């Protein structure tokens with residue numbers, strides 16, 4: 171710390187790290203970049219991969235949303251208790267990111283013509299996570315183990331935006347449903363989900379959700 | 380241990396971990412799954428995400444190539460000397476994974492009509508790595524720190540296949556060129572890169588490269 175988040179005025183790839191920080195009682199500076207400013211072409215070229223979010227831990231400057239989540243999980247005790255749990259949380263996060271990539275393409279490239287096909291293919295993309303919970307204390311604890319990890323925050327965030335995109339996508343996934351309701355109930359999480367910062371912030375940058 | 384790689388008869392997303400295991404003097408078993416066997420649909424459903432590669436490390440089974448690479452780095456000491464380097468390495472690997480994703484898209488879904496555009500845009504995608512090396516000991520060591528890490532193996536593999544796709548794409552990147560030659564010169568990698576198993580394995584599933 172101190173933490174600073176440089177990103178567009180949307181939840182997108184910054185919301186999971188925001189929940190994580192919040193749930194851990196951490197504070198951070200918010201450096202919002204409007205599309206207008208972005209198109210000026212002054213910030214983009216100074217970005218490692220020419221993209222946001224950009225993360226600053228004071229001395230360390232980072233890019234790549236998942237790399238940032240992993241850094242936070244590792245430097246905050248949210249990365250499992252051993253090497254086996256760490257490997258599994260990664261396997262989980264990788265799956266979360268694959269689905270997120272598809273979500274983004276849909277939202278920004280073919281919402282109208284693709285949504286119908288997306289929602290229909292969604293169940294087969296959620297099952298792997300339902301299966302992971304069943305194999306872990308009947309799905310009573312977390313995605314991996316019994317302690318909140320950076321992978322949970324990413325998964326939770328991914329499931330929440332999908333419930334918005336398709337209201338009943340978790341109806342056939344008991345474990346995931348309760349899992350979502352539970353984590354959301356967590357004091358600082360529930361509070362984060364109701365804060366104006368979050369509430370007023372659009373999920374995506376094109377007004378689609 | 381022991382180590383077992385379950386994947387199609389190609390290098391693709393398994394060559395980097397193989398090269399990694401090779402440079403560490405480690406041996407492993409290969410369970411080659413053919414296209415005809417995969418089409419039977421017996422194995423696919425047993426995969427967490429319905430895809431390969433599948434990795435077995437003793438009683439630990441893993442899916443997702445980058446999760447597998449991270450597991451090996453952590454367990455074999457190829458994940459930096461501290462948190463700062465670990466975060467930096469994930470930032471690199473994620474970058475490598477974004478370009479790999481685009482590479483696969485070109486190869487499998489738009490090779491003939493998109494290659495020109497891809498190669499023309501490639502310099503912009505390689506610049507970040509050149510930059511990363513110049514900021515680390517002037518670029519005489521590795522991608523992050525003074526010790527080889529899982530990120531190097533993934534980047535090295537990606538760079539090698541891009542030289543096959545676009546001969547001389549590293550001509551305008553002195554650090555990245557010398558980097559490849561340097562790492563490819565490592566005795567164990569030098570041997571792997573010329574080993575029959577590696578050589579006899581096509582780069583991708585459709586023969587295009």
Ligand SMILES: N[C@@H](CCC(=O)N[C@@H](CSCc1ccc([N+](=O)[O-])cc1)C(=O)NCC(=O)O)C(=O)O
Nearest residue numbers: 178179180182183205220221222223234235236375
């Ligand atoms: N792998 C990278 C992917 C980053 C990425 O896609 N970044 C987008 C923003 S998230 C998606 C997004 C797009 C637009 C808005 N907006 O408000 O206009 C918000 C979010 C970006 O920087 N785009 C700028 C560019 O490439 O030039 C990661 O995980 O961090």
Ligand SMILES: N[C@@H](CCC(=O)N[C@@H](CSCc1ccc([N+](=O)[O-])cc1)C(=O)NCC(=O)O)C(=O)O
Nearest residue numbers: 387388389391392414429430431432443444445584
């Ligand atoms: N994010 C996952 C992506 C995995 C992936 O794309 N897997 C492909 C194989 S690598 C790309 C590939 C495709 C085809 C061949 N082939 O020989 O026919 C080889 C490699 C797959 O399992 N496809 C089967 C399916 O989805 O049903 C990861 O990083 O591991």
